[PDB]
């Protein structure tokens, strides 16, 4: 579980948002991508894998997660792919936060990263951003 991630692709304002959820912590990373292609998903995954121990990703079967460029990035980074309502829980939570801050950002992409911040930093002892590093740190 220290290295299991859920990745999903959702749409806001007629744009594409890539969402990665570290299932065990609820930590989120997200980005607005130019297009729903394997190329952009491979880039995102490569960045994700250089930050965190990414061992397995669960995605749906869209052409952007099964394409050739995604398969190669996962081979190179050493990530096994597989093809829950955890995704939907997070997409809804993220959309709600984006809606609440959107007026403070010239562009969607900025609002997305504001919402990711707000999500990862909020406490209830241990935010999701604190939980992910504690999970990993413990795994060493």
């Amino acid at each position: 579980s220290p290295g299991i991630w859920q990745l999903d692709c959702t749409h806001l304002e007629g744009k594409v948002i890539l969402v990665a959820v570290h299932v065990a912590s609820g930590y989120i990373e997200a980005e607005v991508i130019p297009a729903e292609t394997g190329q952009e998903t491979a880039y995102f995954l490569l960045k994700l894998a250089g930050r965190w121990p990414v061992k397995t990703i669960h995605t749906d079967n869209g052409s952007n997660f099964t394409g050739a460029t995604v398969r190669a990035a996962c081979d190179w980074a050493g990530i096994k792919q597989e093809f829950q309502g955890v995704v939907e829980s997070m997409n809804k939570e993220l959309k709600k936060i984006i809606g609440q801050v959107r007026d403070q950002a010239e562009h969607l992409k900025t609002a997305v990263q504001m919402a990711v911040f707000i999500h990862n930093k909020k406490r209830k002892g241990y935010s999701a951003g604190e939980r992910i590093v504690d999970i990993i740190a413990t795994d060493i």
Partner: peptide
């Protein structure tokens, strides 16, 4: 803003 289940959205905050 409000983002709906379908891809559409509104500038108005309904919730």
């Amino acid at each position: 803003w409000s983002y709906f289940y379908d891809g559409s959205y509104s500038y108005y905050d309904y919730e």
